[PDB]
Design a protein that fits this description.
Strand content of chain A: 15-25%
Keywords: ion channel, volume-regulation, membrane protein
Entry title: LRRC8A:C conformation 1 (round)
Helix content of chain A: 10-25%
Number of helices of chain B: 9
Distance between the termini of chain B: 57 Å
Largest sheet of chain A: 9 strands, mixed
Chains A, C, D: Volume-regulated anion channel subunit LRRC8A,Soluble cytochrome b562
Structural class of chain B: alpha/beta
Order of helices and strands of chain B: HEEHEEEEHEEEHEHEHEEEEEHEHH
Oligomer: part of a larger assembly
Organism of A, C, D: Mus musculus
PDB class: membrane protein
Distance between the termini of chain A: 33 Å
Strand order of the largest sheet of chain A: 1-2-3-4-5-6-7-8-9
Radius of gyration of chain A: 25 Å
């Protein structure tokens, strides 16, 4: 079990328990554990020895009904802070999870629309005053009012409905403390006024919201906090010039769409540091990209760009160039100007040869420079040796 | 046996920048594999007696499938979904039945990698001539001992664009099936034992490139009709046996890429370098006696490889052409590097490895894009720069 | 106040300021404070 | 044409060179180990890329063929070891470019 230990995207020590009869005492003996994964553990009774798990902060009860008693309850109320309960039944949801004081991250997966239990089982969310993250992958048709009273202290609300329109009715105006409204697969096809009515959202990711025309972006300039407006996975067919109003944007991820072209006025946001346009229908890449001096990773993979403008290389802060699978005729030698470039995707394309100026980039290495073997071999032997030596060490 | 965490460990990338799961010599396909929905490519190697359930409908992100030496079975929902979603396929048919018959019920398929082998009765493979159901197929690479091009390709010529065939010593015949190519753009024939370029290639009016790899082209006399390939920019006739180059090269000037490496050419004519649009010219590991001065006509050249030649004389007109980005003259019979070499401003690559040189001139500093890596030479030639030139060169 | 924004010394794990008005604090202030919880 | 090192061990058997080695344009290290030549053929100092020359156990009583090595610009290391060399002529002072004079 000790060599079984692993780490997550949060770089927190986990361990995945998967078809276990219960929790072994050897599991609870571990004291460095951060995330305990009770997944598909049939009706396991949690013993008080969970107090040995001093570092325990994350529990993901995936189809695992947890039977608990008073001392383990006290230890979890005083220690545990994040809890991602995945269930397929109301009985699978334990009633003690609403009694935890220090809980701040709570994730639900599984349909919640039921008879005489719609938004009543979660009435204990008022007891939980430390809740800040509330993910509901529950295919719900409307946001519950108990969650609205919780939203006074809630800072993050992510809804996953799997293609079900959520009845907004501007009912999210109560959660003035909301900071990251990530409507995942909500299939809204419009932006309600509650999204730009609250003033506290920095990151608004409308993932698979199916918005045809991105027209409510003028009202987002009052959102001084807004710096991450990820409008990916939509039928946006054209970008109106009005987005030039929003100058505070940094992480504009506009990928996997049918954008015919990003205009010059889109580059009017000089604060843009991370720009994703991958899997799009761009005609080309304009010159006003030279304005975005803060750009670090520009991603136009599998889009339609025939020639790389020198204004792209005029910026020096580029770090991750997702330029693969394109119709780039050739890569200009001006890439030798780029120093921050630590990785560049050049596989596929119509790339005739790689210029020797790629060796001028210090941070770039073999793992960074992903390209076909023959095209890499087109480079002179000694610069390839230099790149190899800088890679392996 | 295979937990999802083990599959996370197995997760990797492939030659097409997709999320690949390499599954090697497995008893079957687990449903835990299909539980992963972020997957972009599946690699199944010699996993035979395998039936694809409806559960692959979980993972929508698939674009590539590697069905290697494995007899696979199918289910109706799997047919529907892989008709709707799958586009890239790479199968290996070590046995003819290890090729499954259901690849051809799809339509969205675009890339196909038909690596393996074939028998004498080539035309009897009805598995090939069902790609009429494929509408989006654009890449076809058949590494097999195929002697006759099937009528399959004849049918699918309307939408097919790329050919890559490795016969490996097998003679390719029946070239009318390649005549009735119409919309094809790329043709890479390797070891097809084609003695002469057929009228099939000239029947193609939209061929972007041609490869006659490992094909015994003793003479090139059918180039007269090569003018019909206006899209032809690439002529990679390398490791070939072209003994001399005639005037017929004047038929096409849209030619850009020109690989005659390891060719039998003795003397270049006055008639190659008339086609000024050529930028990419290769004569690597040939045995040319000398370079005539008509090379001065090729100004838009950006690559001139004649490495390992017997060339004792480089006239200064190739040094006069400044647009020449790459210029490989390695292991020739030349004597002295040109002192007036700094005039070439856009000279990115000068492979002159193994040439019998004496002393490098000081004007390498005037060269803007020539490095020690670019000017690959023996080290006793590297040691020759003046001390101030070393100070200016170590700082480039 | 916005004086909880920039400096790398006075931050949340140092100063546990009121979290009711920490929400109305600017996101760069929250950046310094969450930096405390990381650094 | 591409080969750069040829070291032949023969346990005391003399080869018939007959100046058939002049296609060694790319040869850089001609190492005749236990050749027992006692003489230096012209093909040794005709090959301009030779940098390593050790006539080991060849029983050279006299070494007299260093003067014709100046056409060969690349010689940098004369490891003349394990030999019957009785004396070095003073003309060895003409060289300047060696590094690992063994």
């Amino acid at each position: 079990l000790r060599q079984r230990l692993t780490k997550n995207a949060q770089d927190k020590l986990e361990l995945h328990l998967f078809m276990l009869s219960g929790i072994p005492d050897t599991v609870f003996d571990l004291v460095e554990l951060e995330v305990l994964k009770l997944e598909l553990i049939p009706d396991v009774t949690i013993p008080p020895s969970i107090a040995q798990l001093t570092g325990l902060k994350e529990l993901w009860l995936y189809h695992t009904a947890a039977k608990i008693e008073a001392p383990a309850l006290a230890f979890l109320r005083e220690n545990l802070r994040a809890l991602h309960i995945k269930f397929t039944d109301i009985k699978e949801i334990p009633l003690w999870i609403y009694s935890l004081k220090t809980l701040e991250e709570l994730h639900l997966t599984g349909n919640l629309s039921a008879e005489n239990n719609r938004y009543i089982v979660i009435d204990g969310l008022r007891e939980l005053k430390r809740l800040k993250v509330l993910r509901l992958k529950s295919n719900l048709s409307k946001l519950p009012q108990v969650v609205t009273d919780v939203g006074v202290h809630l800072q993050k609300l992510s809804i996953n409905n799997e293609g079900t329109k959520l009845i907004v009715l501007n009912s999210l105006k109560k959660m003035v403390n909301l900071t990251e409204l990530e409507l995942i697969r909500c299939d809204l096809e419009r932006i309600p006024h509650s999204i730009f009515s609250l003033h506290n959202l920095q990151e608004i990711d409308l993932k698979d919201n199916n918005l045809k025309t991105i027209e409510e972006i003028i009202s987002f300039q009052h959102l001084h906090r807004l710096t991450c407006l990820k409008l990916w996975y939509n039928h946006i067919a054209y970008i109106p010039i009005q987005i030039g109003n929003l100058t505070n944007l940094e992480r504009l991820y506009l990928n996997r769409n049918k954008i015919e072209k990003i205009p010059t006025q889109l580059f009017y946001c000089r604060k843009l540091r991370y720009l994703d346009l991958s899997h799009n229908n761009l005609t080309f890449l304009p010159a006003d990209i030279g304005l975005l001096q803060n750009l670090q990773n520009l991603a136009v993979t599998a889009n339609r760009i025939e020639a790389l403008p020198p204004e792209l290389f005029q910026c020096r802060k580029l770090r991750a160039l997702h330029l693969g699978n394109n119709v780039l005729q050739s890569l200009p030698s001006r890439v030798g100007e780029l120093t921050n470039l630590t990785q560049i995707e050049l596989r596929g394309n119509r790339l005739e040869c790689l210029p020797v100026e790629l060796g001028e980039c210090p941070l770039l290495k073999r793992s960074g420079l992903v390209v076909e073997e023959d095209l890499f071999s087109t480079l002179p032997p000694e610069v390839k040796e230099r790149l190899w030596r800088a890679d392996k060490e | 046996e295979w937990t999802p965490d083990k599959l996370r460990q197995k997760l990797q990338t492939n030659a097409h920048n997709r999320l690949e799961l390499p599954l090697i010599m497995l008893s079957g396909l687990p449903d835990t594999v299909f539980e992963i929905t972020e997957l972009q490519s599946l690699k199944l190697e010699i996993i035979k007696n395998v039936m694809i359930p409806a559960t692959i409908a979980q993972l929508d992100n698939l674009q590539e499938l590697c069905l290697h030496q494995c007899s696979v079975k199918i289910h109706s929902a799997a047919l529907s979904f892989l008709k709707e979603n799958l586009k890239v396929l790479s199968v290996k048919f070590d046995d003819m039945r290890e090729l499954p018959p259901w690849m051809y019920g799809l339509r969205n398929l675009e890339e196909l990698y038909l690596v393996g082998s074939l028998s004498h009765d080539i035309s009897k493979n009805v598995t090939l001539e069902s790609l009429r159901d494929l509408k989006s197929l654009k890449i076809l690479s058949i590494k097999s001992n195929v002697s006759k091009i099937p009528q399959a390709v004849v049918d699918v010529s309307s939408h097919l664009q790329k050919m890559c065939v490795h016969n490996d010593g097998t003679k390719l015949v029946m070239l009318n099936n390649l005549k009735k190519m119409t919309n094809l753009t790329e043709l890479e024939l390797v070891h097809c034992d084609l003695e002469r370029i057929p009228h099939a290639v000239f029947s193609l009016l939209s061929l972007q490139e041609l490869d006659l790899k490992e094909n015994n082209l003793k003479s090139i006399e059918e180039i007269v009709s090569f003018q019909h390939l206006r899209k032809l920019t690439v002529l990679k006739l390398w490791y070939n046996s072209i003994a001399y180059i005639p005037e017929h090269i004047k038929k096409l000037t849209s030619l850009e890429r020109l690989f005659f490496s390891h060719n039998k050419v003795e003397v270049l004519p006055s008639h190659l370098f008339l086609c000024n649009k050529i930028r990419y010219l290769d004569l690597s590991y040939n045995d040319i006696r000398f370079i005539p001065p008509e090379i001065g006509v090729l100004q838009s050249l950006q690559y001139f490889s004649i490495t390992c030649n017997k060339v004792e004389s480089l006239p200064d007109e190739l040094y006069f052409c400044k647009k020449l980005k790459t210029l490989k003259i390695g292991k020739n019979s030349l004597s002295v590097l040109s002192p007036k070499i700094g005039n070439l401003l856009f000279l990115s690559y000068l492979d002159i490895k193994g040439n019998h040189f004496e002393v490098l001139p000081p004007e390498l500093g005037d060269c803007r894009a020539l490095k020690r890596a670019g000017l690959v030479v023996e080290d006793a030639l590297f040691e020759t720069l003046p001390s101030d030139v070393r100070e200016q060169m170590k700082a480039d």
